Ligand binder design. Structure first.
Ligand SMILES: Nc1nc2cc(C[C@@H]3CC[C@@]4(O)[C@@H]3C[C@@H](n3cc(F)c5c(N)ncnc53)[C@@H]4O)cc(F)c2cc1F
Lengths: 311, 625
């Protein structure tokens, strides 16, 4: 038996997978092919039940496809839609239904990336319209609209504990370090050589000045904001690095997602420890379990929810 | 009315989205044929063997809906000029797959972006797609007036925006288009989809797109301002570009989400329809020129060929032309015979090339206005035109007009003429052989005799038109030289073009020719200063003529006769386009050559670079004697 309001069929192409502090798994699916080209939001209190529709906790269908997803506290869900709107969907008191809070069409093109800031009251969004908007989740409006890049914004990542600091990368070969406290917030950083276009961004959960980025060639690089010159880099994948996620350990492990249908686990020196080719399609999002820190759940366009045992 | 389209990068239900945009008033819809995020793999496994379908079915819309309402869109992830070999190879196969699917649906247009300098491999894949099967499908190249790198917010601390003036750097997007269309060998299937930014560039950057094949104008919702009532409007400078684009008859495309939440999506289109209705109405010339805009016509040869009845009817429906001819004879009669000789002296008028009798009737009205005695001689070589003159002579004119069915160069007049009237002029004045005809006719004109017209000068101006160059390039005919089309002039209402320099006088002729050794052969060197970066495609020809004293007729844009529409400008093209920089001078050499049987034009460019001598010995073009 499936919960009320939830659809009978889940969309084939899985884009997002995010674990909530209690252990509940949040899923973001999109219909990229076929007659209908919309998206859907799903919640699983039992992570092993996914991707089965009739074994979920809450379900709803959005008007357009889901490009990116992020947890807003414990009930709010921020959606990066193709319609050009940044949506917010709040979970009800019984946690059985997913109701819409706001749907504001501010971006002129597909919103490809979203990241909630340290406080949880503000959030940042990157779209194909080259713009980066700072949102106010309580007032449901845009505080600041920025056009610093020259091409489509690929990834936006809010710093772990700073409300003013956030990273942004685009197809214009620019990695910008932001600080809303500055008159000119953006700042161009990276390696000595321009190299290949940046695709993914990940802040270190312990070091507030260190971060990692993946390029379109499959290379993952360790960057320090102070040195502004790349110290360590390794060719992890054969194709574009989709995303990078850190484990909740005191000494964090780095999970690398790519279009080459493989997932890799790296240490502090970016050395390969674990590799899985279980996915038949593009690995889109990875999430570490808050209960079992050695467990990592990944989703792909092949409608698969694979739970990995990281040694 | 404005032919409009809606640009959307998100279509959940094709039947519901098309029905919604049609309700708003959009004539067409710019939408993706494949999902913009659905990245496809063609080489590496297991991503290569992805289960289908790859996109939505063609059965969702009728054949008519795909052929007229849907405009295709290339996926943003397709980058054929990427530095990564894997992305470069995958984008080539994805570009072919998307273009072939657009040809399968039979779409009237397909959008492809020009967002960077290097688009060589993108040009290679598109040119290969055009040469794979014969199709009429269009390809709109999405290129902005200002590059996104040149309009970005100055918010990067270590990388600030260039505040210094860069004349050539500001016109970088035109070079992206120019390089792309040159690589694609000027394909008529490739057009410009010009995107207009929030802040307009300098007037010279907007002037780079003059003479370019613009079929679409993209207007984002962000560029629209908001008035006191809440309706979306545009700035006075933005409106100027809309009126300029409306003249070229482009299709306006609206992109981006609605920022005016209080109003509907139709409010943006309502303002475009308002500007189309509040624009200056087409004048007597602008209404007549409709349909003939950039339409190439062969220059008339009335001496060699006998013209049709409908060709004379078009010549006759010009009131301004014959009103000036009437005033020219009216002024000449009073200057030749005074008030004391208004009944004892009769002036011998000779209409050389009478046609159907418009100058013959104008000579009769001029005599009634000046109150003077006249004796008309209506000379015409065309026997078909003589049938109309002889029927006019018997029914109305009477014994006053003497119809002569002979050539003016071979006719033996019984008496000498006081005034000789003619309309032998063409678009380039002497191109229809007016000097040669009057030189062999001035023997039967009295020693103090007057000629109407008595003087005429041709004018040349360098022009830039990639549209007209491609129109001449398509005029290739079998059983003749494959480059003969470039070595001949064309009478054309020049519309989508750019005048690079002010028209300068070329060849001048005066009648009667008092010279002891009359030579109609000419050689002229013209130096045109160019203050813009451009590409020379040809030379526009105009003419000025002095009928009598202050009474004149002109097709020169600076001194054009108001209401007159008999002659459209002439066009002398060049085999190869010449790149001209700012401050450079265009030097053209024009020759008027002739023998006993034919007269022709020869032309060559000598600066900034040298061109081949066009039409040597009259191999491609000749005006028979
Ligand atoms: N481009 C344009 N050209 C125009 C030309 C004309 C002159 C017409 C053309 C037909 C015609 O009857 C007449 C002139 C005649 N004609 C031509 C000769 F060389 C000739 C000659 N040698 N003897 C006797 N008559 C002759 C010729 O047969 C009339 C216009 F209204 C024109 C308007 C235009 F826009």
């Amino acid at each position: 038996n499936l919960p009320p309001n939830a659809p009978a069929c889940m969309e084939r192409q899985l884009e997002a997978a995010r674990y909530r502090s209690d252990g509940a798994l949040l899923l973001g699916a999109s219909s990229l092919s076929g007659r209908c080209w919309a998206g859907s939001l799903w919640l699983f209190k039992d992570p092993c039940a996914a991707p089965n529709e009739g074994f979920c906790s809450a379900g709803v269908q959005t008007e357009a496809g889901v490009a990116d997803l992020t947890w807003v506290g414990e009930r709010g869900i921020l959606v990066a839609s193709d319609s050009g709107a940044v949506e917010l969907w709040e979970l009800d008191e019984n946690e059985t239904l997913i109701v819409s809070k706001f749907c504001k069409y501010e971006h002129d093109d597909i919103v490809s990336t979203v990241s909630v800031l340290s406080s949880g009251t503000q959030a940042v969004s990157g779209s194909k319209d080259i713009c980066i908007k700072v949102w106010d989740l309580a007032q449901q409006v845009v505080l600041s609209s920025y056009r610093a890049h020259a091409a489509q914004v690929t990834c936006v990542a809010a710093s772990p504990h700073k409300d003013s600091v956030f990273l942004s990368c685009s197809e214009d070969n620019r990695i910008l370090l932001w600080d809303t406290r500055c008159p000119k917030p953006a700042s161009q950083i990276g390696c000595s050589a321009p190299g290949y276009l940046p695709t993914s961004l990940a802040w270190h959960p312990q070091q507030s000045e260190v971060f990692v980025f993946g390029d379109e060639n499959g290379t993952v690089s360790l960057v320090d904001t102070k040195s502004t010159s790349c110290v360590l880099s390794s060719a992890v994948h054969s194709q574009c690095v989709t995303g990078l996620v850190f484990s909740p350990h005191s000494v964090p492990f780095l999970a690398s997602l790519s279009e080459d249908c493989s997932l890799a686990v790296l240490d502090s020196s970016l050395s390969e420890l674990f590799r899985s080719q279980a996915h038949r399609d593009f690995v889109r999002d990875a999430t570490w379990s808050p209960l079992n820190h050695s467990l990592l759940t990944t989703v792909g366009w092949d409608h698969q929810v694979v739970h990995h045992v990281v040694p | 009315r404005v032919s409009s389209g809606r640009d959307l990068n998100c279509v959940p239900e094709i039947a519901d989205t098309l029905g919604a945009v049609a309700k708003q008033g959009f004539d067409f819809l710019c939408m993706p044929v494949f999902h913009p995020r659905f990245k496809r793999e063609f080489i590496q496994e297991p991503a290569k063997n992805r289960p289908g379908p790859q996109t939505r079915s063609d059965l969702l819309l009728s054949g008519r809906d795909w052929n007229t309402l849907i405009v295709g869109k290339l996926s943003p992830w397709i980058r054929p000029d990427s530095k990564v070999e894997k992305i470069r190879r995958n984008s080539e196969a994805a570009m072919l797959q998307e273009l072939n699917f657009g040809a399968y649906l039979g779409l009237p247009a397909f959008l492809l972006p020009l967002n960077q300098e290097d688009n060589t491999n993108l040009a290679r894949v598109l040119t290969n797609h055009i040469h794979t099967g014969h199709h009429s499908s269009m390809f709109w190249m999405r290129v902005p007036l200002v590059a996104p790198e040149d309009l970005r917010d100055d918010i990067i601390e270590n990388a600030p925006t260039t505040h210094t003036e860069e004349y050539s750097g500001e016109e970088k997007t035109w070079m992206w288009w120019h390089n792309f269309r040159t690589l694609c060998d000027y394909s008529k299937r490739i057009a410009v989809a010009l995107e207009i930014g929030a802040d307009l560039p300098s007037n010279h950057v907007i002037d780079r797109w003059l003479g370019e094949p613009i079929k679409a104008a993209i207007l984002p919702t962000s560029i629209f301002l908001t008035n006191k009532k809440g309706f979306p409007v545009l700035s006075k400078m933005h409106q100027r570009l809309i009126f300029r684009l409306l003249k070229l008859e482009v299709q306006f495309i609206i992109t981006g989400t609605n920022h005016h939440s209080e109003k509907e999506f139709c409010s943006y289109l309502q303002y475009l329809e308002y500007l189309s209705q509040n624009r200056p109405p087409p004048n007597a010339y602008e209404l007549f020129a409709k349909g003939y805009e950039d339409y190439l016509q062969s220059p008339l040869q009335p001496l060699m060929d006998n013209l049709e009845s409908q060709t004379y009817e078009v010549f006759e429906k010009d009131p301004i032309k014959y009103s000036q001819y009437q005033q020219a004879i009216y002024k000449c009669l009073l200057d030749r015979v005074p008030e004391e000789e208004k009944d004892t002296n009769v002036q011998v008028l000779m209409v050389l090339g009478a046609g159907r009798g418009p100058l013959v009737n104008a000579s009769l009205r001029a005599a009634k206005q000046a109150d003077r005695r006249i004796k008309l001689y209506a000379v015409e070589k065309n026997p078909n035109a003589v049938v109309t003159l002889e029927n006019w002579q018997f029914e109305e004119w009477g014994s006053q007009v003497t119809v002569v069915s002979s050539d003016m160069r071979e006719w033996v007049a019984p008496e000498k003429a006081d005034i000789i009237v003619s309309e032998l002029l063409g678009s380039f004045a002497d191109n229809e052989l007016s000097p040669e005809c009057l030189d062999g006719a001035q023997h039967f004109l009295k020693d103090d005799g007057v000629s109407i017209p008595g003087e005429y000068t041709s004018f040349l101006a360098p022009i830039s038109s990639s549209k007209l160059y491609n129109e001449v390039r398509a005029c290739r005919e079998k059983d003749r030289d494959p480059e003969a089309q470039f070595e001949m002039p064309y009478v054309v209402r020049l519309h989508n073009f750019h005048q690079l320099s002010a028209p300068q006088p070329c060849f001048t002729f005066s009648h009667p020719n008092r010279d002891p050794m009359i030579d109609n052969n000419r050689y002229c060197t013209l130096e045109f200063p160019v203050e813009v970066n451009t590409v020379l495609h040809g030379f526009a020809g105009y003419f000025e003529t002095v009928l009598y004293q202050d009474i004149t007729l002109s097709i020169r844009p600076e001194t054009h006769s108001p209401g007159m529409f008999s002659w459209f400008p002439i066009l002398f093209p060049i085999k190869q386009p010449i790149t001209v920089r700012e401050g450079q001078t265009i030097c053209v050499r024009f020759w008027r050559c002739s023998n006993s049987k034919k007269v022709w034009y020869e032309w060559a460019v000598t600066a900034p670079v040298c061109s081949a001598i066009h039409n040597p010995t009259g191999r491609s073009y000749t005006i028979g004697l």
